[PDB]
Amino acid sequence: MLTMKDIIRDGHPTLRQKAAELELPLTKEEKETLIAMREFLVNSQDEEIAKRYGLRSGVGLAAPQINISKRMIAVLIPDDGSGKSYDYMLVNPKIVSHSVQEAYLPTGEGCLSVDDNVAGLVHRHNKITIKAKDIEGNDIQLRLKGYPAIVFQHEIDHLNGVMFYDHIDKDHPLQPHTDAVEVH
Ligand SMILES: [Zn+2]
């Protein structure tokens, strides 16, 4: 199983590189890796398991975070009471279209690759449409909004060597952009 010791931290060169496109079909190893990435999220969200292995809870993970420069991500967002949940392992995910209007989490964002918290709003697109392949090479096209849209953009950013704090304004980190959607 993957644990915190597999998660590389801010400063590691791989986090700033541009992950390489995956050739389909994925190799056996690449599939096992993607499955392990999702499994890590599962474990991180289980109170008992996370405690036992000292895992930091999270809803997204990108291959670069475990030092694998490949364009693969895993997103595991639990039911928000709305009945909506997101359990996706994506290969070569790409935002094909998006809203002009932005959105942001009121408390900012966090990342397992960044040990300490960083204050500041991270404005992203409120709505996005992503096209990707799934673990078996089949086609997936997602229409996301709000929180999940923010999570996927955060993960895709990892594939381009972009960290969440790159989006935080230095002078006015907590000042919301006019007309931006505060995601509750
Ligand atoms: Zn992250």
Swiss-Prot record:
Provide the E.C. number(s) assigned to this enzyme: 3.5.1.88
Keywords in UniProt for this one? Hydrolase, Iron, Metal-binding, Protein biosynthesis
Q: Which positions does UniProt annotate for Fe cation binding?
A: C111, H154, H158
Cystine residue pairs? none
Enumerate the catalysed reactions. Answer: N-terminal N-formyl-L-methionyl-[peptide] + H2O = N-terminal L-methionyl-[peptide] + formate
Q: Which InterPro entries match?
A: Peptide_deformylase, Peptide_deformylase_sf
Q: Which cofactor does it need?
A: Fe(2+)
Pfam families found in the cross-reference section? Pep_deformylase (PF01327)
- Which residues does UniProt mark as catalytic? E155
Supply one GO BP term: co-translational protein modification
* Lineage top rank: taxon: Bacteria
MF GO annotations: metal ion binding; peptide deformylase activity
Q: What class of enzyme is it?
A: hydrolase
**How does the cofactor attach, per the note?**
Binds 1 Fe(2+) ion.
Would the keyword Nucleotidyltransferase be found if you checked this record's keyword annotation?
no
List, alphabetically, the Gene3D superfamilies matched.
Peptide deformylase (3.90.45.10)
* Biological function: Removes the formyl group from the N-terminal Met of newly synthesized proteins. Requires at least a dipeptide for an efficient rate of reaction. N-terminal L-methionine is a prerequisite for activity but the enzyme has broad specificity at other positions.
Family to which the UniProt record says this protein belongs: Belongs to the polypeptide deformylase family.
Q: What protein name applies here? A: Peptide deformylase
